[PDB]
Amino acid sequence: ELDQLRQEAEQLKNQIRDARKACADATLSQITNNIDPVGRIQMRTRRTLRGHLAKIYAMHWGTDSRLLVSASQDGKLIIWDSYTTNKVHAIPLRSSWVMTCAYAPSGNYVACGGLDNICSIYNLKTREGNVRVSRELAGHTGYLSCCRFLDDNQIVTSSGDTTCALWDIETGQQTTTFTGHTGDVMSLSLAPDTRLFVSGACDASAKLWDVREGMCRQTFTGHESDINAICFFPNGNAFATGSDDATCRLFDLRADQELMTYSHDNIICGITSVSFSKSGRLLLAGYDDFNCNVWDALKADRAGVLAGHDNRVSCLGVTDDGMAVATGSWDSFLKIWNGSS
Amino acid sequence: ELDQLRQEAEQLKNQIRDARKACADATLSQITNNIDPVGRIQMRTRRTLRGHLAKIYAMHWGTDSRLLVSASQDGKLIIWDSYTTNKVHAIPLRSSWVMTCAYAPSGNYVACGGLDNICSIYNLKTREGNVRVSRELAGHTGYLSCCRFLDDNQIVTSSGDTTCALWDIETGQQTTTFTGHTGDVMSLSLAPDTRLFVSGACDASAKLWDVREGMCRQTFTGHESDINAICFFPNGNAFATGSDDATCRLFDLRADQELMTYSHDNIICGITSVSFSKSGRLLLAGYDDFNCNVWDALKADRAGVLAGHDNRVSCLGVTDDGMAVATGSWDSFLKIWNGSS
Amino acid sequence: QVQLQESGGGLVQPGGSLRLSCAASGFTFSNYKMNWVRQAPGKGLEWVSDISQSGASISYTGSVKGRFTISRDNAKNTLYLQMNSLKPEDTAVYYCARCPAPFTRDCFDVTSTTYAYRGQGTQVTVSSH
Amino acid sequence: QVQLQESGGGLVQPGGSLRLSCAASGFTFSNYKMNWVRQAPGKGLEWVSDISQSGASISYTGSVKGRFTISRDNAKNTLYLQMNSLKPEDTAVYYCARCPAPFTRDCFDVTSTTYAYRGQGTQVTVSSH
């Protein structure tokens, strides 16, 4: 019984591999030879945000690219103003251990989660000005790893039990459950149209899930170790993935296979956060070796390096307009980098 | 390696059985048909000895058939005078649990033992009249089951670890060790000439040991359950054994096999003690069903029944001259039975 | 001489069936209570099942109830253990043991290292191949 | 895709010799530390042995030290476990495991129920016949 199913599964993997090989018309690097190189990029720290007691684990940018949300292990959730550096809110978290935080597109609500396995969402529309726990979600057995906002009522949540959930804020119950992973889901990214989202887990694989039907569409297996960071391409037809093996890989949904791999012999440390620019030409990946590297998504060349953190860069975010990049490390500091002419 | 040795042992065992069958010229019962039956024997309780607190476990007669030694589980070792009922000594034993007691042929020393695994010997020659522990022996791991006196300096001891020892009183160390049993040795009997002694164990077998050489000579396997009692024939060329299977069997050293079995359908209880008479014609075996039975050693007929005990007859002894028989039970009473004309 | 011989055993695929035979000689089989004992690799002896003199009373340990069937035959002087739904954890050496005393409900040291009233035993290995 | 295939095993007489082969594909064998894990019947997973990237460091469990030998061939991308003087209690299902991260000395959850970087394994049965 088991043998006949395992052999059939292996035959299916072989067929999928053959299909992938058949459609491999050429290589992305080969067709990008006749492209002017991006060249050296110099970015200078414009704003430095300090005040967090413990290490910063995650952060999220705002829709207007003005307010950002940061979470630290001390139990503080601080909303920063990137322009004037002013602090707008400082929410004392019920659980000190927080691993992720999300900013709603409307900015009215802010989500978070951590080892408590509880996704706490706070409402900023209160007239009194006192922030409060608008809603609490408890349906995940594993540690809370990531969460993204779909709208004012729907949120996509990732946990460490190899399950992703789609919660409804008003009812406080899971609407759709995604169970197709064999390892802890680390992070997920939302498509520009908020139709499909891909998730990276500890099984060295990335799965594409549809919000409505709730069934996985495509599975990508090109990494050698745990996948830590995932982000969508600006056009939504591709996504870049980072792992512990010191390698970033770009996957194309239409091609159903990896397009190019960004790896360096000198680099041997892991990758924590990755994100694209507005145009998608640049790929800013935060590395474990106390600094971040800006790669060229087309030429696989190190466009620039950002070394301004005393510890590993835990999170990295890019504004919607791409004006600046905010990097949070374990040194309790948030650095905002902007290009100069 | 194990198979080639086990098969050889089985082949040897077959050879012994064939040798036993070859020499089986006839049956003892067949040749005793032309013998006048013993007839009914009526024995009356002449002396009743009381004063022990707990159950009597063992007793031994003296050489002169005047003084007897009794041991009780309460920790007392009382020397009784069979004629006038007077008590001569009452030894407070260090260990309450006592399973055997011995009376030296000279009468100067008395031995005892029990669950403590210590064989305590007391000297009655003290001029002050105050008894004391003359010697203590500690070389047995199992419970002390039986012990018999060879002389004032040599004692044969049986323990519950399938080991029999020959201690030297003056030195207090084992002189010879007998290790050929696979079960707990319950009791042993001394030959009249003190050259060979037989031991019965829980492996449903009886072994003959040589005191000087220290090596087993013959092994008898005719019982079905644990052997509890064993006694020599007056002439020394045979011995009778009692077991839990409610059967007594007579074994002949020269014939190397059992001669005749004393069993009754109505009797289903175990056997605790057995002893021969002066002439050996009678077999007085103390049964578990609250009474003792006197069997005919040549006709396998119940000569008489002694029912004067409130509990199981733990021990039974016969004088050297055969005038009377003393039986000890768990009712704390010692009954002396003598025949009447 | 009381001797017990065990027959049957060997390699058995999990979920299969097997039969164990215990031939007794040297005593009255009907009168004595019977027992079965097993010893797993690296573990001690553990009691498996028991059957009374007439077979009117039978018992089983929790790990085997409903899987094994114990029966005795007085006329043929043999004891049986029917095994089915075998699992890989049941591999062990099975011993045919006799309660030491007759006409008795108890038997104390059947599961003892140096018991002198048990057979050599046989090896049973539930291994898939 | 990361996959590990185990070869060798089956029925072996006690005191004999055996060889276990672990073929690894889908990653750099040299850069990842390797491990051997066994699961006895009715018991949980237990760590057997480990070998470093270059093989200069090797360790063993107390129940196995001096009995098994572990070696790795980077050129052939294979891992070996040479077993001799086997005992009946050594029967178990052997898994070939890999440390989750490269260029690291620590392996946290190798001996875990839902480890996703270990092979299917092979069955080894040390039973005499």
Q: Please tell me which residue of chain C has the smallest CA distance to B243.
A: C101
CA distance B185 to B158: 6
Q: Do D103 and A13 touch (CB under 8 A)?
A: no
Best residue in C29, C114, C118, C123 for a mutation probing chain B (most B CBs within 10 Å) = C114
Q: Do D27 and A226 touch (CB under 8 A)?
A: no
- Is residue D1 classed exposed, middle or buried when 0-12, 13-18 and 19+ CB atoms within 10 A define those classes? middle
DSSP-assigned states of every residue in chain C: --EEEEE--EEE-TT-EEEEEEEEESS-TTTS-EEEEEE-TTS-EEEEEEE-SSSS-EEE-TTTTTTEEEEEETTTTEEEEEEES--GGG-EEEEEEE-SSSS-S--SSTT-TT-SSB---EEEEE---
- Separation in Å, CA of D8 to nearest CA in chain A: 18
Three-state DSSP at D24 gives: strand
CA distance A145 to A327: 18
Strand partners, B154: B168
CB-CB contact of D46 with D95 (8 Å): no
Q: How far is CA A316 from CA A57, A59, C75, in A?
A: 10, 7, 86
Range of the domain at C27: 3-126
Nearest neighbour of A245 by CB, restricted to D102, D114, D116: D102
CA distance A171 to A93: 23
**Tokens, residue B251:** 């074994």
Which residues precede gaps in chain C, with C-N > 2.5 A?
Answer: none
For residue A335, the Cα-to-chain-centroid distance in whole angstroms is 18
Query: Using a CB-CB distance cutoff of 8 angstroms, which residues of chain D are in contact with residue A7?
Result: none
- Separation in Å, CA of B202 to nearest CA in chain C: 8
Three-state DSSP at D63 gives: coil
Instruction: Report which residue type is found at C52.
Output: S
Instruction: Return residues 63-92 of D near C (CB < 8 Å).
Output: 88-89, 91
Number of neighbours of residue A251 by Cβ within 10 angstroms: 23
Three-state DSSP at D23 gives: strand
Provide the residue count of chain D.
129
CB-CB contact of C119 with C83 (8 Å): no
Strands across the sheet with B185-190, in order?
B185-190, B196-201, B206-210, B216-220
Cβ-Cβ pairs closer than 8 A, B with C, add up to 28
Interface of C to B at Cβ within 8 Å reads 1-2, 26-28, 100-103, 114, 116
CA distance B231 to A241: 92
Q: Which domains does chain A have, with CATH numbers?
A: 1-339 (2.130.10.10)
3-state secondary structure chain A: CHHHHHHHHHHHHHHHHHHHHHCCCCCHHHHCCCCCCCCCCCEEEEEEEECCCCCEEEEEECCCCCEEEEEECCCEEEEEECCCCCEEEEEECCCCCEEEEEECCCCCEEEEEECCCCEEEEECCCCCCCCEEEEEECCCCCCEEEEEECCCCEEEEEECCCCEEEEECCCCEEEEEECCCCCCEEEEEECCCCCEEEEEECCCCEEEEECCCCCEEEEECCCCCCEEEEEECCCCCEEEEEECCCEEEEEECCCCEEEEEEECCCCCCCEEEEEECCCCCEEEEEECCCCEEEEECCCCCEEEEECCCCCCEEEEEECCCCCCEEEEECCCEEEEEEECC
Residue B129: which residues within 8 A CB-CB, separation 6 or more?
Answer: none
Q: Do C123 and D125 touch (CB under 8 A)?
A: no
Interface present between A and D (3 or more CB pairs within 8 Å): yes
Q: Please tell me which residue of chain D has the smallest CA distance to A267.
A: D103
CB-CB contact of C21 with C78 (8 Å): yes
Strand partners, B235: none
CA distance B152 to C24: 48
Interface present between A and B (3 or more CB pairs within 8 Å): no
Q: Do C91 and D129 touch (CB under 8 A)?
A: no
Report the largest interatomic distance among the alpha carbons of chain C, rounded to a whole angstrom. 46
Best residue in A225, A272, A287 for a mutation probing chain D (most D CBs within 10 Å) = A225
Q: Do C91 and D89 touch (CB under 8 A)?
A: no
Nearest neighbour of A225 by CB, restricted to D1, D102, D114: D102
Query: Using a CB-CB distance cutoff of 8 angstroms, which residues of chain C are in contact with residue B204?
Result: 2, 116
Nearest neighbour of D100 by CB, restricted to A13, A221, A226: A226
CB-CB contact of C45 with C37 (8 Å): yes
Q: How far is CA A289 from CA A310, A329, B120, in A?
A: 10, 11, 81
CB-CB contact of B285 with B242 (8 Å): yes
CA distance A312 to A291: 7
- Separation in Å, CA of C102 to nearest CA in chain D: 35
CB-CB contact of B231 with B240 (8 Å): yes
Query: Using a CB-CB distance cutoff of 8 angstroms, which residues of chain C are in contact with residue B267?
Result: none
Q: Please tell me which residue of chain B has the smallest CA distance to C28.
A: B224
Query: Using a CB-CB distance cutoff of 8 angstroms, which residues of chain D are in contact with residue C125?
Result: 125, 127
DSSP-assigned states of every residue in D82-127: EEES--GGG-EEEEEEE-SSSS-S--SSSS-TT-SSB---EEEEE-
Query: Using a CB-CB distance cutoff of 8 angstroms, which residues of chain B are in contact with residue C100?
Result: 202, 225-226, 244
- Separation in Å, CA of D94 to nearest CA in chain C: 14
Instruction: For strands C10-12 and C122-126, give the pairing.
Output: parallel
Residue C45: which residues within 8 A CB-CB, separation 6 or more?
Answer: C37, C38, C39, C95, C111, C112, C113
- Separation in Å, CA of C56 to nearest CA in chain B: 21
CA distance A286 to A300: 16
Query: Using a CB-CB distance cutoff of 8 angstroms, which residues of chain C are in contact with residue B183?
Result: 116
- Is residue A323 classed exposed, middle or buried when 0-12, 13-18 and 19+ CB atoms within 10 A define those classes? middle
Q: How far is CA B134 from CA B88, B99, B111, in A?
A: 18, 19, 10
Query: Using a CB-CB distance cutoff of 8 angstroms, which residues of chain C are in contact with residue B202?
Result: 100, 116
CA distance D46 to D40: 8
Q: Do D26 and A202 touch (CB under 8 A)?
A: no
Residue A299: which residues within 8 A CB-CB, separation 6 or more?
Answer: A29, A32, A35, A37, A38
| Run of H or E including D11 | strand D10-12
Shortest CA distance to C35 belongs to which of C116, C100, C82?
C100
**Tokens, residue B279:** 């002439």
CA distance B106 to C14: 71
Give the CATH number, domain containing residue D65.
2.60.40.10
Q: Please tell me which residue of chain C has the smallest CA distance to B244.
A: C101
Q: Do A226 and D116 touch (CB under 8 A)?
A: no
Q: How many domains does chain D have?
A: 1
Query: Using a CB-CB distance cutoff of 8 angstroms, which residues of chain A are in contact with residue D27?
Result: 224
> Does C42 touch chain D if contact means CB atoms closer than 8 Å?
yes
- Is residue D31 classed exposed, middle or buried when 0-12, 13-18 and 19+ CB atoms within 10 A define those classes? middle
Which residues precede gaps in chain B, with C-N > 2.5 A?
Answer: none
Write phi, then psi, for B311 (nearest 5 degrees): -145, -170
CA distance A263 to A300: 8
Number of neighbours of residue C62 by Cβ within 10 angstroms: 5
Query: Using a CB-CB distance cutoff of 8 angstroms, which residues of chain C are in contact with residue B224?
Result: 2, 26-28, 102
Write phi, then psi, for B11 (nearest 5 degrees): -60, -45
